[model samples]
Every structure is written in C-alpha cells, then in structure tokens.
Target chain A: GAMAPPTLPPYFMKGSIIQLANGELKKVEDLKTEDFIQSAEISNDLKIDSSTVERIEDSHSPGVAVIQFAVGEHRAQVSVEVLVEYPFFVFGQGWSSCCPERTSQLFDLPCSKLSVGDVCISLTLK
Target chain B: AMAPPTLPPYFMKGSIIQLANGELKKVEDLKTEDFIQSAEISNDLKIDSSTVERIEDSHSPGVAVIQFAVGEHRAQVSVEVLVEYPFFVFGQGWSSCCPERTSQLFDLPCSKLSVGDVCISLTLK
Candidate 1:
C-alpha cells in the first residue's frame, strides 16, 4: 500500500520574548535555531509584584540563569541556545563554602581569549 | 525611598526553534509577554514501519511554516514588540483540547472559541 502523507492542523505559529527589568517586554517573531553569544549579564532585577520575579532558567546548565520569558501562542514557539566561555575553569576540587561566585569567576576570565561554541535550543509548538 | 534602577545580567542572549511542523519549542533564553501572535499544529498520518502499519504524528503545517524556515534570521528578530491586543483570546478557546493542534488560531473571535493559551516547554543548551 502507498504511504499516506502527513496531516497537520489548521493554525500554528511560534515566536520569542525578551523581558527587561523595568517591567517591559519585547516580542521577537523570527528567532534562529543556532548558538547565541551575550557579553553582558541578563537577569531580572525588578520584582513583578512582591512575590513573583520574572525569570527563565537555562535548560542545559542550571548554573547559568536568565530572567526572560518565552511565550508560545497560536502556533508560535520560542527556543534559545546560549554559549558562554571562560578563560579558566573555576571550582577545581570540592570545597565547603569558599567556591568563587559566578559573577566573580566570570569577570576574572578574559572572554576575548576564550573560544566557545554556541548553545542552542529547539522548540516545537503544537 | 527611591527605587533602584533595574539591570540585566551579563552574557544574556537567545533564539527560538520553529520545528518541521508549525509547533514551536522554547529552548532557553527566550521570553514571551502580552498579545503575541504565533501558530503551530500536530497531526496524525498513516505510515509503514518495517512492514508494520502504524499511525504517527507528523509536524508539517503548510505555507507559513515553509516561509518561516527560509526567512532571514536577523529580519525575524527585528519584529519584536510590546503591544496590547486580544489576539490570544481566540487562540486560547479554540486550542482547548489540543494545544499544539490549534496554535495558529490567532486573530479569531473569542466569542466563537473556549480555552486559554497554549503552554510549551523551552529547552536550552
């Protein structure tokens, strides 16, 4: 018997959102499925109300955190991949409480000297 | 007391993945807020695997999905905006049963619809 073709629903789309600290949000319709590089920190400093803070977490490395929102409406979905390279690796052996903080360790490295591949995400809207 | 200025973290960036089908998956570093319009769908079709007849869900939305794939990455990101409108109300109602199936129902009349917006998981690397 001949194989049947794939069937799809009527409406479907996908996109992305970048949330800022001042309670402002931006929507991006066309996002790529490749690695992205950021030279600055991206975190939510302002509280949405008092209990909730707008934030998004890194899917691969939890040590990395982001304060952005990804909205999937209609058929539009958003996916992301971030790549950060440090000049030197911190946390050598296990320690009690003297581990260097993320910010401190990151700032100390020479990013220009690092060569890191891009991180990426693949989101499929239903 | 005066409120302190809000600042974003260093090294923050992201992208979105529009699958072969219209459905979208938010990988990581992406955010969506307010009346944003996008679409996706999932359908089942018959196929033969190793001579065994079976049904499988295929991700293939027609025209719009193709255009999105070929479009320039830079131009797509430039369309980001902060606007207000009830585009998702219709999307929400129509997509009740199958969130992924009714993803493209934006701009329709809510009076003729029923559910809320669809929720998708974003996986980042």
Candidate 2:
C-alpha cells in the first residue's frame, strides 16, 4: 500500500491570526483540518486566495520568531515558533517544487534565516 | 526636571565587550562615538574597530536571552543575534546559533556549539 506524505505541524504562534474563508478571523492554534483559510499567491503581484487545511499536527517550542516586513502597500508581521534549522517557503527568498519558476540557489530558509525588510506572502489581513 | 535614564536592550546590557584599546566594558555603558573592538565574520573573523553609532533601548525585559560559554567566558546574547552573528569555533570556522549553519567549514552556526567550543572575543584573541 502507498503511504501518504508526512504532514508538518503548524508553525504559527498560539495567538497568531488567520483569515477564514467566511471573512472571520481565527487563531492558528484554533484552526482544524479541512478548514479553508486565506493565503497569498505572488504573481505579477500579491493575490489573495482560499486554501484548505489538509493535515494538522502539534508541537511545542520554547520561543517564537517575530518577523516584520513590508509587502506592497501593507506593513505586516508574523510570529511563529519554528525550527531554527528547517526551511519554509518565502516569496522573494525561497520557494519549493510547487513553484519551479523561482528555482534558484536562494535558501528557502527557516525563521532564523530571515532578516528585516525581507518579504513573504501574507496569510492574514494583518 | 530630570528624565529617566535610558538603557540598552536587556539582552546586550550585561554582556562584556572588549574595546578597541583593549579595555573591557559593558554594552550598557557604551556611548556613541566610543570605539569598540569588532570582528568581520565574512572576512575570516578579522578583528577590527568600530564606533558605536546608535544605541536603542528596545528589548523588552520579559524576553529571555540565550546563554552559552565561549572558552573560559560565557555570554548572553539575544536569540535574533545568536543566528545573525557568527561565533567562531576552534579548529572549525564561524558557526551561527542555528544547527543548520553549524559546520567545520566557514559556514558556521553557533547553536550547536558545545561548552568546550572556543568563541572568538577580542580580549581572548
């Protein structure tokens, strides 16, 4: 039998906000599997879309990474408890196989690799 | 009328710093235009002198700093700086605070540094 790909835990901080499909805001820790949340897609510009929560997992971290950035006309921030070594997808810095269009030597880095002024896709209106 | 005295960030205040003239000073005591010994990590951890430009009292008191030993001395640095600044390891090159960046090569990450690891300081160097 074929096995399903492993699912990664949500890295958003406990109080971090996410936009629901119905225009309601929910905390990342409160989100459940099969829920739809708004996410950003960077095309000619940043576009908003709805995406489903496929698999959910949970873990604990001692501290959270606080990131601040400016995207388009909006200034925003994200706080998450993330692995220091692992890599995550960022818009201008790194992307995965899903977007081979951005293939480069850039590091699809973890929170530790991010710097001030670096841009990433927004998951919530804030 | 007297205004409250400003202090540097909590994470940096208590740490010991070496000045360009071979004097040890606290980060909180550092004043603008004062010359401090600094290292250029990208260039083989070359020791150099730099003047303090701006000192901001930004870090909140509730925030905890990571404490680790660098040879005989220990230091407490902010989590953000632990990754951004490279710490040198004896026999190995610079290491950052993240495990992904720790290595024997020049790409050093310090989080993986052990107690025995030697961290470069101007006074020690």
Candidate 3:
C-alpha cells in the first residue's frame, strides 16, 4: 500500500528508507509488519529563574518523548517518516528544515549539532 | 487550548494535523503552526486477530490490543475490532482530508478530536 502520509502529509515516500540515530535503517512500509527500536533520555539543568539572583535548578523529564521528521524533494509541506517509539527519544533541536537557496533542490532536517555536546555546570553562591 | 474540529465544517474534520512539538491538532489551524509530526488518520487499515497477543480496554469503552508477528515470519491477518479507533477504522471519513483538502465541507461523520488521539499508547505486556 502506498501510504501518502499517516493522517496528514508526510516526508518520506512509501518506498523510502527511515534511518534511526541508533544506526538501524529500514524501509518506510516494512515497519507496518515490524517496529523500530529507539530510546529516551532524562536529566536535570540549573539556571537563574525569575527575580534578582534567584539562582536555581529545573528538572526536565518527559518520561517518553516522540520525535518526528520531514524530508524529501517534491513536496508542499512534504511527507515525514516517523518511528513513533514508545519510550520516545528525548532530543534537543535548535533548528528548522531548510530549503537553502544555496542548495537549490537540496534540503535538510530541522537540527542542532552536538559538537562534543553542551555542558553548563557551575557552583553559584552568594 | 482550542476546542477540536466540529466548528464550521471542511472545514476537513476527519484528518489530524500533528504539530512538530508532539501534539495532535485540529487541521484547520495548519496555518499557524510550523511543521507537522504525524497524521491521526481514521480507518485507513484493517485489523487482525489471528496474530492476536491480547486485548486492552484500560481506557474503558475504548479498547486497545497488542498483535505481533514476523520473528521474520509474517502474515496478512484480518480481524473484527471490538472497540477500534479510526483514528483505527475510519477510512474515508472525509472525501479528501489528507495531503490536501478532500472537500470544502466535511462530507462524513464529524468525529471529535480528543486527547486520546494525541496520547501515545503504552507498551503492552
């Protein structure tokens, strides 16, 4: 069956391949007969909240997170391929899908590069 | 915070627009959001029980089940859904509510969009 999209338009086509961050690559249609494997992450972060020097920490935990993506050429809103992981992956993206006049027919996913990643740990005291 | 579907019509109500941040949304509001996540389509595929693992109805009135196959082996199994979702069994609810508008006014049974559609299924035991 040629699934145009799940319910709305999608990124990849029926015959397209969905690549996982964990290094597993599978076809879009084959998943109907199987499921892909992925994971979720949780941690803590601290920073200055409201008013004057009220330094503090905040907890960001989503238990399970869902990550969806859009890719392909001939598309209006484009078709996106989804793994729909149950223990959904906890990801941090600081970007958007780009058409980049520079790449002409080329495109990219909404993204954020993790170069050695980011670490902000400190001992804030008065 | 907005009430889902059932407003004016075609208002294409059968289709769900997934917001990039993981929210199943009312499709009419597509203009305001950034990109889509996934579509909560109604009745596009059939269900099967020959490979039935078990049935779930924790969300009472609403039933969910776990059916698996292909340890490599697979089968095109068919089933009689007890309490299915079409957003599960609602194929062709709207004449044209996917990738594009199927109509100017919804031509099918207008189902209400619920947090249920946005809610993810729990891993079955």
Candidate 4:
C-alpha cells in the first residue's frame, strides 16, 4: 500500500533586507508574506535566515541586492533589481513541496477523492 | 442510529429587483452584473447577483445601496461591518458543522454519517 504524504506545516518568511545604490539598506517589517509562497496547488515550507542579505551585481547593475535563503532541501536565491526614480524595494522567494504529488492529500486520499465516509477534521486556533 | 448532519448545498441569490431612490430603476445585465455581483469558492462555478452600490443620502444621512438576488439552498450568509475610520472589514457566517463537536467526530467511520458526498466547485473566467 502506498503511504499518504505527510501534512505540510505552515511556515513564514521574514527579515528581508534590500540594498540601495548609496550603500544604504532598508529592512522590511510588518509586511505580510503568504504562508504558502508557491501556487496553491504546490506545497512546500520556506524559511529565511537572519544573515541572508548581501549585495551582488548582475549584468553591470550597480544597486542589485542578492538574497540567499534555504528552501526545503535546496538553496533558494533571488535577485532584487534596484531602481532610482521610484526607489522602492521588492523581493520574493520560490517554494515547492517535497512530495508534490501528495502534498494536499488527506487520509491517504486526494481532496477530490474524498468520500462521504471520509473523516474531516476542523483546525483549532492557538 | 444517529444520522449525520446534512451537507449544505452552495447557493446564491439572483435576478434581484432594485428600486433606486424611489425613481431610478434598471435591470442588471448579466455580463456587466457579473463584475459587480459574483462570488466563488474555488474555480469551477460562480454565483451572480445584482450589484450593491453605496450612495450618499440626505434622508438616511449616509451612503446606502439596495439590491436583491436569489439564494441557493443551504448557502451560508456572511455579515460584515466596517466602522468609520477603520481600514479593515470583519465578518462571520454560519458553517455546516460545530467546531468542537466536529473535531471529535473525525475519528469515526465516514459511513456512519447521514449526509452523502458534499463538495463545492467554483469556476472563474
């Protein structure tokens, strides 16, 4: 018998830092990041390390910010392109499930395959 | 034998007649109306209704809009309220099952319930 996939735990990414052309960096706080970063269908956990901010250049760009983080079992990387006129910061992380096929499976069955007798549990708030 | 609670069907109110300011009357076109009055859960089906617009009124001394629609059987009604300077909307609705009681019942066999298959499908364009 095929074992059902493990329940994906809810996690969040934070402590995002962006660098500017004037050697200045701004920290993003009070920003809401999606619990599930990737598409709704995919399931994966993403966490941002505190020491994951640095400056890097790509294609002769001067103010590019290089973001490094650990996603699941792989090293996730993202490059934030800097702008001068608007002077705004934007960054994001990509995430995917370890068991993409069975990520949303409940009780060894996909949600679409749930039957009348299938047990459904309600989530409790902390 | 104890019967399982019946599964509620997804429904929406439609073809609502509106009397605006006791003078202006209009029928909502489905295509244009969809943008104003449509609800969905997933992405397989959509419920369309009349649009509800807010207008400043001297009689009520506030903004108001009246609309109507047909509601489906077992559809949940959600009520939301936003106070004068608050930037968020808060609301609640009646769900199919009790939170605490339904939690303990999950351990039981599915066949023991009375209701059959219950699912919600929403389609988006």
Chain B TM-score, one value per candidate, order as shown: 0.13, 0.29, 0.20, 0.18
Q: Kindly indicate the candidate among 1 and 4 with the higher lDDT.
A: 1
Note the Cα lDDT for every prediction shown: 0.21, 0.28, 0.22, 0.19
Question: On residues B83-113, what C-alpha lDDT tens digit does candidate 4 reach at each position?
Answer: 1101100111111222232222111111111
Ranking by lDDT: 2, 3, 1, 4
Question: For residues A32-122, could you state the per-residue lDDT of candidate 2 as single tens digits?
Answer: 3233212222222223221211221223432222222232333312123322322233434432222132212222112324343333332
The numbered model that scores best in lDDT is: 2
Tell me how candidate 3 scores on lDDT. Answer: 0.22
Candidate 4 ranges beyond 4 A from true positions: A1-31, A34-126, B1-93, B96-98, B101-121
Residue A100 lDDT in candidate 2:
30
Predicted structure 3, TM vs. truth? 0.20
lDDT of 4: 0.19
Tens-place lDDT per residue, model 3, B1-125, is 00000111112233344332444444333331122122222122122212223334333222233232211144322222212122221221221112111121222342332221221111111
What TM-score fits each model?
A: 0.16, 0.20, 0.20, 0.16
Regarding lDDT, does 1 or 3 come out ahead? 3
The digit string of per-residue lDDT tens for model 1 on B1-125 reads: 00101111110122233443444443231224211322112232111111111212224222111001111121111111111111122123211223322222211122221222222221111
DockQ of each: 0.06, 0.01, 0.02, 0.01
Runs with alpha carbons beyond 4 Å of true place in candidate 1: A1-61, A66-126, B1-115
